[PDB]
A paper describes a structure:
Despite significant functional overlap with BoGH43A, BoGH43B, the second α-l-arabinofuranosidase present in the BoXyGUL, shares just 41% sequence identity with BoGH43A and appears to be significantly less active on the substrates tested. Crystals of BoGH43B were obtained by hanging drop vapour diffusion using 0.2 M sodium acetate pH 5, 20–30% PEG-3350 as mother liquor and they were used for subsequent structure determination. Remarkably, given their apparent differences at the amino acid level, the structure of BoGH43B appears extremely similar to that of BoGH43A, which can be superimposed onto BoGH43B, using GESAMT, with an RMSD of 1.24 Å over 482 amino acid residues. Comparison of tertiary folds reveals few significant differences between the two paralogues, with the most obvious being the presence of a metal binding site, occupied by calcium, towards the C-terminus of BoGH43B. Such an equivalent site appears entirely absent within BoGH43A. However, the Ca2+-binding site in BoGH43B is located in the C-terminal β-sandwich domain, on the opposite side of the molecule from the active site, and similar sites in other family members have not been implicated in catalysis to date. Superposition of apo-BoGH43B with AraDNJ-BoGH43A reveals that the three residues implicated in catalysis (Asp38, Asp148 and Glu198 in BoGH43B) are absolutely conserved. The only difference in the BoGH43B −1 sub-site is the replacement of Phe93 (in BoGH43A) with a tyrosine residue in BoGH43B. AraLOG stacks against Tyr187 in BoGH43A, which is replaced by Ser196 in BoGH43B.
In this context, we recently reported the characterization of a novel xyloglucan utilization locus (XyGUL) that confers Bacteroides ovatus, and species harbouring syntenic XyGULs, with the ability to utilize this abundant vegetable polysaccharide across sampled human populations. Here, we present the three-dimensional structures of BoGH31, BoGH43A, BoGH43B and BoGH3B, expanding our knowledge of the structural determinants required for xyloglucan degradation. Our analyses highlight key adaptations in these enzymes that confer their specificity for xyloglucan oligosaccharides, while also providing a rationale for the maintenance of two divergent genes coding for GH3 enzymes, and similarly two divergent genes for GH43 family members, within the same PUL. While we were unable to determine a structure for BoGH3A, our structural and sequence analysis of BoGH3B has also allowed us to highlight further potential differences between these two enzymes encoded by the operon. Together with existing biochemical data, our analyses of the three-dimensional structures, and various enzyme-inhibitor complexes, of BoGH31, BoGH43A, BoGH43B and BoGH3B provide molecular-level insight into the stepwise breakdown of xyloglucan by the BoXyGUL.
Numbering used by the authors: 25 to 531
Write the structure that this text describes.
């Protein structure tokens, strides 16, 4: 048996893992998206199932006012000690955020606690449980790493933060984790940046408090030295040890199109870690995270496939569905028209930093088909609803039903650099159901419509123009249902009977 990387696709950056007996749990960063910090579950490190989110409530994910793509939830760390799971991270820019927080749970599916604010703004806070102590390791935004000890109950520092080590020469020392393995305490961290020079490095000491000395086989993992490789910007790893004693790393990376641009976001990868004779870890001979590997020494456990169609025919919204900042439940219902997701477009659109009536999911494949049957009668030109390809608040493609010159129409509208650049309309019948459809390849999104007396490819757009390299920030594309009255509320609701999502990267 083998597996193909990546192990979790679509926007899933900054992976943090822990093993609790036969079960593995993993979290990734979410930024402005709610619920925050999804928790995935596996029994083989390869097949992952979404089971909850660490931040499923507005009191533990305050997001209002945060910037798209550079605000909200940054790298989380996930750990487990004495019947209790802990997730620590940083919230930047949300009204009511005090910076670094953690939340706890007995069940990793939830419910999680309200935040325990630790009282600083350090990025990439990490925790580890060693010798009956809860260590807190973070960078100091000045090239150095700070270690401290923390009371699990209160989040207060019992031993205060102090400098113990620093980065090893590379840009933006990030993502430090603390491990006690054999004779030594190890600080493993990321350097180089967000780009091609990203790498994981390690150092160790006889004592937690230093001094630390660098690995002679740095880096631990990087695709820096293979510019041909289909995976790039590999880094921000977290280690996990199995019951057979062997070691695996999860880390983030990108899958560029023609080696130039990435739009799906930073995804999660899996690589075997080997320790050399002197006690230093490395992935392979060269540190390169490969496309396929021999399977972990664990029994294969494939999860029941999620169906293509969400029929919106139960009271509980599927866990993959995602909102922008803190959603008011007043804009959506699965109750009010049973069998449909009812979306009520408000005055709010993307141009502010609160929560527009948007519900979407991560584009988890280059090649896909996404479609939705929607009932929407607009009464005036400002009113619209349909599907959106979102990169951020300034960059998104809108496949919407609206009213133009007393005709109900289907519209593809391309917004880039916060300006509308292209708009193409086709006339719909005055009433009746409309199937809106978005199909994707590595390079192109194609937008299609179907109704009574109306079926047509409406337009195309580039994946390149929504890519990280053009738009900046720390996110990747979401495809979602959308309604907005652009200054006014929509008169009528937009009712989505179903939503198909088909990933086709295997073929
Ligand atoms: Ca339905």
């Amino acid at each position: 048996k083998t597996f193909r990387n990546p192990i979790i696709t679509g926007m899933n950056p900054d992976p943090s893992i822990c093993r609790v007996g036969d079960d593995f749990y993993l979290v990734t960063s979410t930024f402005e998206y709610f619920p925050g910090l999804p928790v995935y579950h596996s029994k083989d490190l390869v097949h992952w199932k979404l089971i909850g989110h660490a931040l499923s409530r507005p009191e533990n994910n305050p997001l209002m006012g945060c910037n798209a793509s550079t605000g909200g939830q940054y790298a989380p760390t996930l750990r487990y000690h004495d019947g209790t799971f802990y997730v620590i991270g940083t919230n930047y820019g949300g009204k009511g955020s005090q910076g670094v927080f953690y939340v706890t749970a007995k069940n990793p599916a939830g419910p999680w606690s309200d935040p325990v604010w630790v009282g600083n703004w350090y990025v990439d806070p990490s925790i580890e449980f060693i010798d009956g102590k809860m260590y807190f390791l973070s960078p100091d935004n000045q090239g150095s790493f700070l270690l401290g000890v923390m009371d699990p109950e209160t989040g207060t520092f019992v031993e205060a933060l102090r400098k113990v080590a620093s980065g090893l020469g590379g840009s933006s020392p990030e993502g430090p984790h603390f491990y006690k393995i054999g004779d030594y305490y190890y600080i493993m961290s990321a350097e180089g940046g967000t780009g091609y020079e990203h790498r994981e490095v390690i150092q160790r000491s006889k004592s937690p408090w230093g001094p630390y000395e660098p690995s002679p086989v740095n880096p631990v993992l990087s695709n820096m030295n293979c510019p041909d490789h289909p995976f790039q910007a590999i880094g921000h790893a977290d280690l996990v040890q199995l019951k057979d004693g062997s070691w695996w790393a999860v880390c983030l990376g990108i899958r560029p199109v023609n080696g130039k641009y990435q739009h799906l976001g930073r995804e999660t990868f899996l690589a075997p870690v080997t320790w050399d004779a002197d006690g230093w870890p490395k992935v392979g001979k060269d540190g390169v995270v490969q496309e396929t590997y021999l399977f972990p020494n664990l029994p294969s456990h494939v999860w029941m496939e999620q169906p293509v169609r969400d029929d919106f025919d139960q009271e509980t919204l599927g866990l993959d569905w995602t909102f922008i900042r803190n959603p008011a439940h007043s804009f959506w219902s699965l109750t009010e028209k049973p069998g449909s997701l009812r979306l009520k477009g408000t005055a709010i659109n993307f141009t502010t930093n609160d929560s527009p009536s948007f519900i979407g999911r991560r584009q988890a494949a280059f090649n896909l088909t996404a479609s939705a049957k929607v009932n929407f009668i607009p009464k005036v030109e400002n009113e619209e609803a349909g599907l959106v390809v979102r990169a951020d608040d300034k960059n998104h493609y809108d496949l919407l039903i609206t009213e133009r010159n007393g005709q109900r129409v289907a519209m593809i509208r391309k917004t880039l650099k916060d300006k509308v650049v292209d708009t193409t309309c086709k006339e719909l019948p005055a009433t009746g159901e409309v199937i809106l459809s978005i199909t994707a390849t590595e390079t192109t999104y194609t937008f299609e419509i179907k109704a009574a007396h109306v079926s047509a490819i409406l337009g195309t757009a580039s994946t390149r123009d929504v890519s990280n390299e053009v738009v900046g920030g720390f996110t990747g594309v979401f495809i979602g249902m959308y309604a907005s009255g652009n200054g006014q509320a929509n008169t009528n609701p937009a009712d989505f009977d179903w939503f198909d999502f088909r990933c086709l990267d295997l073929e």
